[PDB]
Amino acid sequence: GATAKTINDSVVTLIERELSGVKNLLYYSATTDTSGTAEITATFKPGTDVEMAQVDVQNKIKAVEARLPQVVRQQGLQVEASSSGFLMLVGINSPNNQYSEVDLSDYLVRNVVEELKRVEGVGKVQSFGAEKAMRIWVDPNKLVSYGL
């Protein structure tokens, strides 16, 4: 429920202030846009334990949870290890156009993404598609005419 400026003012600035305590922290940056989400990336000294750094950022970020806007608290903050590059791109395409983009994405998420996550050494599987859902396209004119 916030614009990029509001997220920067009341979320990004508040959270970034707790990074000073974190051990083996080289630099930290933050990015937000008109998408309703903010990402704060902290870089650590080369050759360090990533899990320890993750837990020690998770512990530090709770200092501002009480002070963080009440709306932000319920959704919560997710701290995770981050890689900067891709390794493989696994795609599904229909030569005969039997299935559209929606169907291909639904199949990929349903039957493949979880299986690929099971592969040894896989860290993340980012699907550039989406699952299927029931979309209700409402017309405001009809609703207001009917009083709803």
Determine the longest span between alpha carbons in the chain, in angstroms.
Answer: 65
- The DSSP symbol for 21 reads T
The count of chain residues that interact with another protein, using the rule CB under 8 A, is 87
Rounded to a whole number of angstroms, the minimum distance from the CB of residue 43 to another protein is 8
Which residues from 45-74 bind another protein, rule CB under 8 A? 46-47, 52, 55-56, 58-59, 62-63, 65-67, 69-71, 73
Q: Cα-flanking dihedrals φ and ψ of residue 40, to 5°?
A: -115, 115
Q: Which one, 104 or 109, has the nearer CB to a second copy?
A: 109
Best CA proximity match to 94, nearest among 115, 108, 84: 108
Which residues from 19-38 bind another protein, rule CB under 8 A? 20-21, 23, 27-36
Where is 57: in which H helix or E strand? Answer: helix 50-61
Contacts of 35 (CB under 8 A, 6+ apart): 4
21 part of the interface to a second copy, by CB under 8 A: yes
121 part of the interface to another protein, by CB under 8 A: yes
Q: Cα-flanking dihedrals φ and ψ of residue 17, to 5°?
A: -70, -20
* Total number of residues shown for the chain: 148
**Which region, judged by CB under 8 A, interacts with a second copy, from 30-38, 60-68, 89-97, 111-119?**
111-119
Contact 86, 123 (CB under 8 A): no
Residues 48, 81, 90, 101: which binds another protein (CB under 8 A)? 90
Rounded to a whole number of angstroms, the minimum distance from the CB of residue 4 to another protein is 5
Rounded to a whole number of angstroms, the minimum distance from the CB of residue 119 to a second copy is 10
Q: Which residues bind a second copy (CB under 8 A)?
A: 17, 20-21, 114, 117-118, 122-125
